[PDB]
């Protein structure tokens, strides 16, 4: 917050349109399974 | 086992006893039949139950687990990450496996006293009012009806009450009377 970020380039530049606000911060992981959703609810999840 | 009751002098269990883990069978002119010592089967269960609940309560602060990801040229810090988790899961497996194996041995040798010590209570109450027969079992010198069995069973037998009944018998199966 309250920080500026100043770009400058004379070529070869792929610029942002959109950035990303960190709203909710907490717990999660990037789980590495290959199953798709099954509409259930748990309190324990594992990739299998 | 250790205490020498279960699979010891008391050779094998009775299938006829269903109400509980330990008990008494009897025989007398009216009766004959089993009856579990619930109050001490009950005390035993309070134990074994606490034991399970103690182990669950030790296994909520294991080493925790959440996930992490590695570059192709960081391969050897990937390794270190792996040796680590695979170190910790080698260690909590051993602790689980061994705890169960040990607490299993103790639980089995716990039941083996529960039964010995029950046998010793009956014994200490009945003294020379009854003949310890040695296969887990006592036979009385004085006849002792269903109302007297409970008294032994609920642990308030009364030695002086049957003393002269009993010792008339002891006195005569000593054949000391055979001298007249
Ligand atoms: C981006 O925008 C933020 C928000 O407006 C700017 O932060 C604000 O900058 C002003 C000064 O320009 C801060 O005021 C200062 O306060 C101190 C002490 O109270 C005073 O002694 C100084 O004379 C000055 O006026 C203000 O607090 C600050 N806002 C907050 C709450 O952070 C900022 O200038 C911009 N980003 C930058 C610095 O590139």
């Amino acid at each position: 917050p309250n920080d500026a970020i100043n770009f400058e380039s004379n070529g070869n530049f792929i610029a942002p349109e959109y950035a990303y606000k960190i709203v909710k911060k907490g717990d999660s992981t990037i789980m590495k399974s290959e199953l798709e959703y099954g509409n259930c609810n748990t309190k324990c999840q594992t990739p299998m | 086992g250790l205490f020498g009751a279960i699979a010891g002098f008391i050779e094998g269990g009775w299938q006829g006893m269903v109400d509980g883990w330990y008990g008494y069978h009897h025989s007398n002119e009216q009766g004959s039949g089993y009856a579990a010592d619930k109050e001490s089967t009950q005390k035993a269960i309070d134990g074994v139950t606490n034991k399970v609940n103690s182990i669950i309560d030790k296994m909520n602060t294991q080493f925790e687990a959440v996930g992490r990801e590695f570059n192709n040229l960081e391969r050897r810090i990937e390794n270190l990450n792996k040796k680590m988790e695979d170190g910790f899961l080698d260690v909590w497996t051993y602790n689980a496996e061994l705890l169960v194996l040990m607490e299993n041995e103790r639980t089995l040798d716990f039941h083996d006293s529960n039964v010995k010590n029950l046998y010793d209570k009956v014994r200490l109450q009945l003294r020379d009012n009854a003949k310890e027969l040695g296969n887990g079992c006592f036979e009385f010198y004085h006849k002792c009806d269903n109302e007297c069995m409970e008294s032994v069973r609920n642990g308030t037998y009364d030695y002086p009450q049957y003393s002269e009944e009993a010792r008339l018998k002891r006195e005569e199966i000593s054949g000391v009377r055979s001298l007249v």
Side-chain angles (χ1 to χ4, degrees):
Chain A
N2 313 281
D3 185 19
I5 173 191
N6 329 279
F7 297 79
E8 163 163 347
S9 182
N10 70 328
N12 310 69
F13 174 33
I14 298 206
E17 178 167 7
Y18 297 114
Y20 282 114
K21 277 170 130 275
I22 298 130
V23 163
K24 197 103 83 187
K25 17 216 155 205
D27 306 351
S28 149
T29 327
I30 299 179
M31 167 151 294
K32 288 290 202 165
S33 160
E34 297 87 335
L35 298 159
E36 241 102 311
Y37 197 49
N39 298 305
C40 32
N41 169 54
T42 189
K43 311 180 202 160
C44 189
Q45 191 68 41
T46 77
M48 289 163 27
Chain B
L2 269 171
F3 273 72
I6 310 179
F9 51 89
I10 320 206
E11 312 176 67
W14 319 308
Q15 313 273 331
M17 186 167 64
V18 329
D19 341 278
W21 274 332
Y22 333 104
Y24 314 79
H25 165 99
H26 70 19
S27 202
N28 61 347
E29 250 292 43
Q30 33 182 356
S32 155
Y34 302 103
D37 183 16
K38 293 176 200 217
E39 190 183 52
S40 81
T41 269
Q42 174 55 276
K43 189 172 273 185
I45 291 195
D46 283 16
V48 167
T49 289
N50 290 322
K51 185 180 282 201
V52 262
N53 285 124
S54 294
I55 308 186
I56 301 188
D57 287 20
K58 274 17 262 167
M59 311 301 215
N60 306 103
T61 43
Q62 269 195 33
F63 165 52
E64 301 272 314
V66 310
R68 240 168 307 113
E69 198 102 35
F70 282 107
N71 178 357
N72 149 237
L73 284 152
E74 293 187 311
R75 207 69 92 179
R76 92 217 131 114
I77 108 187
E78 200 166 302
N79 197 77
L80 178 156
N81 188 77
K82 192 105 140 270
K83 284 287 175 189
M84 153 142 195
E85 298 138 10
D86 286 21
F88 276 113
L89 286 162
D90 271 337
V91 170
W92 286 107
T93 271
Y94 164 97
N95 287 162
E97 271 159 336
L98 164 139
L99 175 40
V100 133
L101 240 23
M102 271 178 44
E103 234 33 63
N104 267 9
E105 176 159 335
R106 292 188 62 88
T107 307
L108 279 194
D109 291 318
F110 172 61
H111 288 299
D112 202 60
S113 335
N114 286 16
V115 156
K116 213 287 149 275
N117 293 308
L118 219 111
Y119 179 88
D120 272 314
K121 161 137 85 277
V122 163
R123 180 162 73 76
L124 283 204
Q125 297 163 254
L126 320 178
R127 318 213 227 83
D128 50 341
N129 276 348
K131 188 185 286 139
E132 197 189 342
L133 236 38
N135 65 16
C137 211
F138 305 82
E139 77 150 33
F140 277 113
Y141 287 133
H142 76 274
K143 32 187 180 167
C144 162
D145 78 347
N146 289 163
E147 129 102 305
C148 160
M149 299 294 311
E150 255 294 298
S151 103
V152 179
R153 248 142 49 205
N154 73 253
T156 52
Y157 166 92
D158 189 18
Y159 192 83
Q161 192 167 298
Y162 317 87
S163 69
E164 1 64 319
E165 193 147 87
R167 52 76 50 187
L168 251 59
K169 222 295 302 195
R170 273 179 281 146
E171 190 205 69
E172 68 98 290
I173 70 151
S174 304
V176 319
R177 184 175 298 140
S178 302
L179 320 168
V180 215

